[PDB]
Each structure stands twice: as structure tokens, then as C-alpha cells.
Design a protein around this nucleic acid. Structure first.
Ligand SMILES: Nc1ncnc2c1ncn2[C@@H]1O[C@H](COP(=O)(O)OP(=O)(O)OP(=O)(O)O)[C@@H](O)[C@H]1O
Lengths: 220, 239, 205, 117, 205, 107, 117
RNA sequence: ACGAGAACUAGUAAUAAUUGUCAUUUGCAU
């Protein structure tokens, strides 16, 4: 409602999750070769490398503006091959996934991006947060495990941060006696048999349990 | 200072002109003693650069939060003033090491002073609980061999600045980085905030030179009761 | 600047259920596996009942702004007129005398009384089970009082006397209205541990 | 002897468990086990009290009595090697082995409690 | 703010069988191994009867939402309403006079009573053994009343004396239809333990 | 560390807490982590004696300070019942120079 | 000790138990022992009061009565040394030994109950 | 004569609130 620019707390104060910030950095992995090596032996004029340059530049200087619209993010430094966006925790993750996919569209799945997102508390000196900072994460973690987990907690109340944090306490200590204890805890919960069964089957497997840890941490 | 790990010792990257990526070498800072002559003679490959970088886990960084309740929180309703400190922690077999040279008497005195210093600190917030150390003197054959070569170039291992009358011939053919080195002083005048050393620039700890220069301990002093010294004397590695 | 230590034992009259763990177990130390009374329980119940003693208005209900001198004793330090707390309530721990007692006579440290619920229009019962600390247990407590203002010692100890006496006629933990958790204080003690203040004229029933 | 801990899943027949075992029928055993787990845990040394040896004797007594009262408890105790391990724990008289039995028994109880009608 | 105490004694007229702990044992303490009457039992029984005395509809029977004045007397704090209980019931403990009396007359504390069922068109018996607290024993109780407001104390104790009468002609415990669980009340004493309220005009039969 | 490992004791306890609103009596719970009872911490202090004639006075002051800390709390929520610490096994040694320290005392 | 254990397996013949002993045949003895248990538990000191000594005397009388009533109970009491043990308990006048006897007899009964028709 | 030196992540609040171990069933056929 106020058009005037507001402070970094203007994104901290979101109540849909912890009151924290998100920062994202991305680099094109195959960009040194692309401007240098380019297309071998037959398209290596000044004209064709020039048009490739213009295409990448216009992508990072218009397409970001359009892609970021539905997101609570302000654009800091973007261009060349550097992507530096800061905003709300959940929003940064969602926008990062959207941008990765939309880039793979525009580069026809030829060029890849590497990116890092971290959770940084409000009112930190931003000079210090900057020096700190795909298909797998989208399909396996966000789409399947996160969705079933969110539905499970939505259906069954009273599963506050206490129950989830006891789940963490059992999980992070990778021991079989802890697996039995987690079985007892899930038995004492009142989730549907499907939810409990899926959680326990995932808990038996290392890759799945790390992914489960990440997903439920995202739930909070 | 130069870091170490369990049994590996490290020196900085010579800013030498290698003619081939220009990417993998840029992300690299330090090259252990085993492969140093290999680096100087092009015997290091890109996959080797990736591997050496991969093995370079020798400590991690952290910010510890703190609050300061000396303020009117003593007196009346008044907010606390949180501040932050930056810290580094080494894994149980890491640390830093020195290289010193001089007469035997000078080194005996240095030993005495170092014994005095191990129970003081070597950092910032010493008095608040950061930065004590225990030291050991070990003679590593390989580092000695590296230090006692003879060549045509020179790798500056410390931070130096040539005196006024030698810089013109010192900078004939060189590759170097300058660093504004600043800071305050301890017990010079009444106000610490009012006293602050004049800024000083010196070559970094990886520069390469053709003609050696000796340095000098330069004053950064003014408006003070005693001289305040800054150090600029090179320790050369000749290959 | 002096500090006065208050010592004694708490004797459980009827079974007590603090039970912060949530089946329905009681809080237990992780070094001895024995029940404890968190000091927050003592401070909160004394706070609440001695507050409800004096004036407690609806506007007073709204903000947890309470009587000036109960606030003085327990500290507010929230808004405006700050007052640093003055009575430090510690936890209470399962005493060694009662440990020897129950070990010798082979008595459990916890009973699991089973309870029922008769819902209406159905009369169908649904059971529950609750752990409760056995009576005759004794817990050892320590209080520390700071003398920030010399002339106010008498009034403050008068009020804490009110607090002890009122607590003896009330409960700790849950199921208080269901019989659970009535306590008594016994073998009290006052002694000056730091400073140059006499504590002979002091008493706590 | 961990096959004795996961025999519980091998004993889900058709549906009743252990032929109709319920954890509710294990309550006296669980109470006694918790009692002496606490008492042993507070103990300093590895050598158990002779009175604690008599306590373990009282454990075997109660186990046999419960096996007599209910048949499902009888099957649970007999086939999972409860009696031999109780005797063995009584034989070594070391604290750590008694805790080992306690962890095994608690794992049994919790895992069984996972499945109930 | 004051608290008015009620003390007295339950006389065991015929057998009493709580048996929450279960051949089919009764509830017993563990510091003396002598039976008790849990306070939850007393409170639930009085609440049920006093509710039934007032109005009780099917929709009211649905989810334990009861008449406003009994709710005030025993507390609900569920329907967005501020109601903590105003009447606290403790447990009852097997009294000293009873212990001495049964010691010097050589009579046990518990009767073991054998019961049978006769199957229809079968005439075959399946026996049962039920253990009950012996008759004529006395337990002592203590209640606590809180005066959240001054102008409902007389009315609330009128309600409580009605409830005590109803209990005097009802059963507390298990199997009360088959001849065990009648009780009586003796030696009611009324004091204001903490506060400045008078306990002279107030009475309970 | 070895004692907690052998007896199988975790290094941190988590206490569940709760708050009571007035005029409402709805409880909002919290979750606060706490270091386990009986844990031991090893510490080192250093005294730089820049004046010979003041070491007695300064260790009297540090004695009185440690005595006060014995009867006080460290960290948060001490009024609510946590943070009470104890000091055992204090030794005072001279590690630089030639000053005697066989008479200075700290409990 | 647990001589009860191997004695109960020594008395399994051909099947009859102590020539047909059943749990219904010891109800009165169990009741009396339980009441003496609770009374003695209520006591503070180890010295047995003369009234509790008279209780032990009447308990001996009741063993003898029941043993005269039925033959199998007589054989059980005779071989399990109940009478010598009671005589020694009366001689000792110590509460702890009486509780130890209580535990022994409870073990006896539990075994007899676990092995039944 | 160390981008130093000063600086308690501190203060307020508990596991609470309503729930009955109950409802039927011959120590019985000689
Ligand atoms: N469109 C472009 N044309 C030419 N050079 C570009 C273009 N975009 C970025 N660059 C170069 O990339 C540099 C950024 O380096 P950065 O460290 O961010 O990644 P990079 O080293 O190019 O990537 P990578 O190591 O993953 O191949 C710029 O300084 C610039 O020289």
C-alpha cells in the first residue's frame, strides 16, 4: 500500500514461516567455453558470437524482470552470468526453481546453472551474507515428499513444532534403536496409515531419509 | 602466516604467468609443499587443481552473536544493542606456521618472546576469549629444500615495500597486488578513536620480482607520544 | 549488596504430575532418571496466585501488568517502568533421604493410576493412564533473594510468606482439581550466604 | 539374538499378533523393568548388588507367572529367548549387560506396540 | 481473595470397589500399601449427579457441555469462556483410627468376594473373584473452595450440600448396583484457611 | 564425555514450557533447549601482573566475584530456575616469570 | 536360591502335580500370607512385635489345619519344608527373613500355577 | 606500537484446562 521503498525488514516480517531472508547466487557453468569455444569450426565469425552475446545479455536483462513478477523479491545485481536476488525464504526457493526451469527452456537444455540459497536472519550486515553464498530437488523433494508431508500435517492437528522436532531428534542420529523409537512415535501419532507407512519406509533408506529431513525442515 | 593440515604444509600461489581454462587456477589460493615446484614448472593439471582444491578443507567460518547490556538496560527501559563477531575454527590437526631467519641469538630471543606470547593472543577480541595457542618448532626437510634453492625469479612470501631509493629499479618486471593496510593503535594518545595509523600500501604475499629489494620498518606515526612501527621486509623464495 | 539463601524440602502429599514431556510421563532428570519440579512451575504458581490475591483488573488481565510489589518481587522488565527481578527460584531435585527410603523399602518412584471417562448420551467409557509422583517423596529446593533496597526486606519476606502459605493450600502440576499435586513445605532455613546483612529476624512457615 | 528382536515382524499372522498379544497385557512386566532399569542406572559400579541379584530372581518369577496367566505372553516369552537371556544376565551380573537386555526388551515392547488390532 | 476449607470423613457403609489398578485388585497407595479413594472418582461422581439434578438435554449430553451454574462450580474453560474450577477435591486416605481399630480387633482391610454367572438355558457357572474395601472403614477428605466473587458463595454451598445429600444416597465406586458403594459423610468442618471471610453461618449436611 | 557415553546420556535436554494468558487461560507452549545437569566445563583464566603490589588485592576481588557467581546464574532464565553452576578443582600456577603463587586462593 | 524352581520340576510325575495339587487348594493360605505381608510392611522396626509373633503362630496353625484337610497339600508342605521354614522364621523374629519367606512362597505358588492341567 | 580497544543473545512468562476404571452377569445343579 506504500509505494515508498522499505527496509530489509519489509520481507522479514512475513508470518508464513520463520521471519528470515533468502539470498540466491547463480553462475552459468558453461559460459567461459561458450563465449570462447562457441560453435566449432563453422559458425565462429564476429557476427555469430556477437548475436549469442546479445541473446544472453537480453535474457538476463529483460527475462528476469518478467519472470520475477509473482514473487516478493527485489533485484539487486543481475547480468552477465551473475544472479543475485534477495527476499523471503520460501519465495526465494520458489523463484529459484522457476528461473532454473525457464532458463533451461530458453537455452534449449544446452547450458546449466549452479545456484546456492541460504537462510539469513534479518538485520545482518548484508556485506557478510553475500560472502557466505535441479530436477532432483524439484521432482523428488519438493513435489512428492513435501506435498505428502504438508497434507499429513494439514489433516492431523496438534503436530506442532514439538512433534516435528522430536522427529528430527530421532532422524539426525542415524541409529537403528532410533528407528525403533521413531516407529513408536509415529505409532503414537494419529496420522493415516498411508502417511505413517510412507514416512517409515522412507526413514529406512539413507537417501530418502536425507531428502525427508530436508523436506520437513522446509515445512517449518 | 601460512596454514597447515595434518601433515601437509602450504604456501601461497605465485602470481606467475602461465601460458595455457583460466578458471580453475583463479579459484585456487594455496599450493602445498609437495607440488610447489610442479606448479612453478607447469606440472599441475586442471584435474589436479580440482583435486587439490577439494582436499583444502582446513577450517570453517562462523558468526557468533552477542549482546551488550552495559547501556541504559542497567538504568531503565532501553533496547539491547546486539553486535556480531567473526571467527574461524580449525579442525583438530590444522593451524598456522611461520618462517623466521636471522642470527642464532635473534632466534633464541624470538623463542623467549614466543613463549611469552603463547598465553597472550594473536588476534582481535583476545580478552573476550579468542585466540590462544601452543607452538612447536619442527624442522621439515622439504620446506628447507624449497627455501634454499637458487634461481632467477623471486616469490615474495611476506608483505614488503621498497624504500624510496630502490623502488624504480625494483619494479622493472613484476606481477603484484597492493593492499591498503590500516588499523588503530594501542596506547599512543588519549582517544583511541582519535588515533588511527595512516594508511599504508604494500605488496601482497605472492608477488614475483626480478630485482631484489631490502625493506624497512616504516613509521605510520604522527600526533603521538611514541613511534608506531609497521613491518615491510621480504622473505624471498628463490625459484 | 547481600544475598540470602532459603532452603528446605518439599513433601508430596498427594501424587504430583508436572509432566512436561507431553504415556503422559513426568519430567525427569537425564542424569538420574528421577522426577523433578522445574523452578518455572514454582515461580509461575506463586506469581499467579499472589497476583490474584491483590487487585487484578480486566485491563490488568489483558497485558500481564500486575501489582507493583508482586512485580517488584518477580520482575517485569517488559515495557516502560523496568524492574529487574529480585527472587530467583531454582529447581527442586529428588532428595537422597527419600531415595534411600524407597530403595530400602522397595517402593516404586512412580505410580500409573488408570482413569476413565463416562461420556453422556452414550455412557461408553474411554480409558486413560497417568503417571504420578509417589507421595512421601521429598524434593530439595533453594531460593535466592537479592537485597537491591535495604529498607524493603521485611515487606518482601512478608509477601513471600504469603506466597508459601497460599501455595500450601493449592496445587502444582496438572489434575489439581482431580486430587493431584498438593505439597507442603517443611524444615525451612534462612541464612546470609553473601554480604553483611543479618537474617535472624526472618521466618518462613 | 537380534533375530529375536525382529521375530516380531515374522509373527504377524492372520489378523492377530503373537496369537492375540496386546501390550496392555505386558503392563506389570513393563513396570518392573522400568523400576529396576532406573535403579541399575543410578548404580555406580558394574558388579551388581546381591540384593539386585535377588531382584533379578524376582524378575524371573514374575515372567513365569505372566507366562502362566496368558498364553500369548507365554509364546512371546518362550520363542524370543526371554528366559535364557534372563538367566544369562543373572549369570554375568554386569551392569552393561543388564542395560543391553533393557534396550532389547524396550525395543521389543515398542516395536510390538507399533502393531495392535 | 480467600480459600474456604472443607474437611470430613467418608464412612464405608457397604463394600467399595474402585479397582483402577486392575485377581482384580483395588487402587492402593504405595507408601503404605493401604487403599485410597482417588479424588477424580469423587469429583466425577458429584459432577454427574449435580448435572443430572439440573437440566440435561441430548444436545447437552453430546459433548460434556453442562448447565451454566454447575459449569461455574466445576469449571470448563472450553467454549471460549474463562472458567477455572472453583472447588478442589483431594484424595482420601485410610485413616489412623481405622488402622488402630482393625489392628486391635484383628480384622482385615479387604474382603475377597466370589461371584458367579449362570448361563441361560445352560445352568453352568463361570466364577469371578472381586476384592472390595471392607465395611465400616473411614477415609478422611479435604476440599478447597475459592471465592472468585463474593456474591455466589452461599448459593454455591447450597449446591454443594445438595450434592453431598445425593451422594449420601448413591454409590461411589464399581458395581454399585449389586450392593457395594454406599457411603456417608461425617464430621464436616468449615474454615477459611487464607483470607478474611467468616465461616460461621455456612453449613453442609 | 566418557561418562555420558558409557551410561548413554544425551548431551542436551529439551524442556517444554508454557505460558498462561489472563482473562483467557489459553496456553501457548514454548521449546527451550538446556545443557544437561552434571556436565563439566574446563576453563582457563590468565592474570597479567603488571603491578607487583596489587596481586593480593586483585585476587581478593576475583575471589569475591567467583563467590558471587557461585550463588547466581549464567545465561538466560535464571530467575525461572536454571544456570546454577559450581567451581571445582582450581589450581593456580605461574607460567611466565619468577613470581610465587603458592599462597593465592580461589574457591 | 530358587529351590522352588527345580523342586517344581522334580514334582512333575505320571500327569499329576504333587499328586493332584491345584491352585484353588491354596487360596486361604495365600490370603493369610498376603495379609501378614501388608501388616509387616506397615511396621517400621525390624524387631517383630509379640502380636506379629502371635500372627505367625496362627499362620503355623493354619498350615497344619490345611495339611490335615487334604493329602496333596500335606505332601506339598512336607517336601517344600514349609513347616521347618516357618519354625525357623518364628525362632529368628526378624522382619527381613519373613519377607524373604514371602518371596519364596510366592515363587512356589507361581510355579505351581504355571504348571497346571 | 595486533581494523584495535570497551560489550552477560539478556528481560517477561509453564504442560496447563474438562474429563468416575465404569455398564450388565445367582457361589450355582445331590
Ligand atoms: N555474455 C557474455 N559475454 C562475454 N563474457 C561474459 C558474458 N557474460 C559473462 N561473461 C564473463 O563472465 C565473467 C564472470 O565470471 P564468473 O566467475 O561469474 O563466471 P565464469 O568464470 O564465467 O563461469 P564458469 O567458471 O562457471 O564457466 C565476467 O567478468 C565476463 O568476463
Amino acid at each position: 500500500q506504500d509505494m515508498r521503498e522499505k527496509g530489509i525488514g519489509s520481507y522479514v516480517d512475513r508470518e508464513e514461516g520463520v521471519k528470515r531472508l533468502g539470498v540466491v547466487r547463480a553462475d552459468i557453468d558453461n559460459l567461459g567455453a561458450t563465449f570462447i569455444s562457441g560453435i566449432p569450426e563453422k559458425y565462429n565469425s564476429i557476427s555469430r558470437t556477437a548475436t549469442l552475446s546479445r541473446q544472453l545479455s537480453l535474457f538476463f536483462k529483460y527475462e528476469l524482470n518478467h519472470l520475477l513478477e509473482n514473487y516478493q523479491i527485489t533485484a539487486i545485481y543481475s547480468g552477465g552470468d551473475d544472479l543475485f536476488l534477495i527476499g523471503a525464504w520460501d519465495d526465494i526457493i520458489e523463484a529459484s526453481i522457476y528461473i532454473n526451469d525457464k532458463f533451461k527452456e530458453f537455452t534449449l537444455d544446452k547450458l546449466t546453472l549452479s545456484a546456492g540459497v541460504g537462510m539469513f536472519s534479518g538485520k545482518y550486515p548484508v556485506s557478510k551474507m553475500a560472502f557466505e553464498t535441479w530436477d532432483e530437488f524439484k521432482k523428488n523433494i519438493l513435489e512428492e515428499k513435501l506435498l505428502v508431508l504438508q497434507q499429513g500435517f494439514s489433516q492431523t492437528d496438534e503436530h506442532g513444532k514439538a512433534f516435528i522436532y522430536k522427529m528430527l531428534a530421532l532422524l539426525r542420529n542415524n541409529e537403528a534403536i532410533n528407528i525403533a523409537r521413531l516407529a513408536y512415535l509415529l505409532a503414537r501419532s494419529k496420522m493415516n496409515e498411508d502417511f505413517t507407512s510412507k514416512i517409515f519406509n522412507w526413514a529406512q533408506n539413507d537417501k530418502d531419509k536425507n531428502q525427508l529431513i530436508t523436506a520437513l525442515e522446509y515445512y517449518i | 602466516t601460512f596454514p597447515y593440515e595434518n601433515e601437509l604444509y602450504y604456501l601461497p600461489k605465485p602470481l606467475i604467468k602461465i601460458d595455457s581454462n583460466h578458471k580453475a587456477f583463479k579459484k585456487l589460493k594455496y599450493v602445498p609443499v609437495h607440488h610447489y615446484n610442479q606448479y612453478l614448472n607447469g606440472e599441475l593439471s586442471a584435474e589436479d587443481a580440482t583435486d587439490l582444491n577439494d582436499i583444502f578443507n582446513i577450517g570453517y567460518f562462523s558468526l557468533q552473536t552477542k549482546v551488550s547490556l552495559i547501556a541504559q538496560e542497567t538504568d531503565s527501559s532501553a533496547d539491547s544493542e546486539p553486535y556480531s563477531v567473526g571467527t574461524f575454527t580449525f579442525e583438530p590437526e590444522a593451524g598456522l606456521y611461520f618462517i623466521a631467519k636471522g642470527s642464532e641469538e635473534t632466534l633464541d630471543h624470538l623463542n623467549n618472546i614466543m613463549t611469552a606470547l603463547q598465553y597472550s593472543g594473536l588476534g582481535g577480541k583476545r580478552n573476550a576469549g579468542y585466540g590462544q595457542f601452543e607452538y612447536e618448532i619442527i624442522n621439515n626437510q622439504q620446506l628447507s629444500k624449497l627455501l634454499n634453492q637458487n634461481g632467477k625469479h623471486s616469490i615474495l612470501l611476506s608483505t614488503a615495500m621498497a624504500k624510496k631509493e630502490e623502488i624504480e629499479s625494483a619494479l622493472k618486471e613484476a606481477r603484484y597486488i597492493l593492499t591498503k593496510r590500516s588499523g588503530f593503535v594501542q596506547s599512543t594518545n588519549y582517544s583511541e578513536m582519535l588515533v588511527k595509523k595512516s594508511d599504508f600500501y604494500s605488496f601482497s604475499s605472492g608477488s614475483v620480482f626480478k630485482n631484489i629489494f631490502n625493506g624497512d620498518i616504516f613509521n605510520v606515526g604522527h600526533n603521538g607520544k611514541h613511534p608506531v612501527y609497521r613491518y615491510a621486509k621480504p622473505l624471498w623464495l628463490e625459484v | 549488596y547481600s544475598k540470602i539463601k532459603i532452603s528446605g524440602t518439599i513433601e508430596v502429599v498427594t501424587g504430583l504430575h508436572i509432566g512436561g514431556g507431553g504415556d503422559s510421563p513426568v519430567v525427569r532428570d537425564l542424569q538420574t532418571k528421577l522426577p523433578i519440579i522445574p523452578g518455572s512451575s514454582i515461580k509461575g504458581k506463586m506469581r499467579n496466585l499472589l497476583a490474584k490475591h491483590f487487585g487484578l483488573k480486566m485491563k490488568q488481565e489483558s497485558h500481564n501488568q500486575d501489582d507493583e510489589r508482586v512485580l517488584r518481587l518477580f520482575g517485569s522488565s517488559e515495557k516502560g517502568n523496568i524492574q529487574r527481578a529480585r527472587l530467583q527460584i531454582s529447581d527442586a531435585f529428588f532428595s537422597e533421604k527419600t531415595k534411600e527410603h524407597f530403595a530400602q523399602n522397595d517402593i516404586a518412584y512412580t505410580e500409573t493410576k488408570f482413569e476413565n471417562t463416562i461420556n453422556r448420551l452414550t455412557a461408553v467409557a474411554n480409558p486413560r493412564q497417568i503417571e504420578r509422583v509417589t507421595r512421601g517423596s521429598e524434593f530439595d529446593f533453594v531460593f535466592i533473594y537479592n537485597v537491591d533496597e535495604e529498607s524493603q526486606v521485611e515487606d518482601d519476606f512478608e509477601n513471600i510468606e504469603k506466597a508459601i502459605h497460599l501455595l500450601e493450600n493449592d496445587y502444582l502440576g496438572g489434575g489439581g482439581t482431580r486430587g493431584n499435586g498438593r505439597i507442603q513445605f517443611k524444615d525451612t532455613n534462612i541464612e546470609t550466604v553473601v554480604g553483611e546483612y543479618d537474617s535472624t529476624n526472618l521466618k518462613i512457615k | 539374538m537380534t533375530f529375536a528382536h525382529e521375530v516380531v515382524k515374522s509373527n504377524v499372522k492372520n489378523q492377530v499378533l503373537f496369537n492375540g498379544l496386546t501390550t496392555s497385557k505386558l503392563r506389570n512386566l513393563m513396570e518392573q523393568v522400568n523400576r529396576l532399569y532406573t535403579i541399575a542406572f543410578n548404580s555406580n559400579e558394574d558388579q551388581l548388588n546381591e540384593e539386585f541379584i535377588d531382584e533379578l530372581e524376582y524378575l524371573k518369577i514374575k515372567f513365569y507367572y505372566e507366562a502362566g496367566r496368558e498364553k500369548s505372553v507365554d509364546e512371546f516369552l518362550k520363542k524370543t529367548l526371554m528366559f535364557p537371556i534372563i538367566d544369562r544376565v543373572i549369570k554375568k551380573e554386569s551392569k552393561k549387560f543388564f542395560l543391553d537386555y533393557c534396550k532389547y526388551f524396550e525395543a521389543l515392547v515398542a516395536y510390538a506396540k507399533y502393531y495392535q488390532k
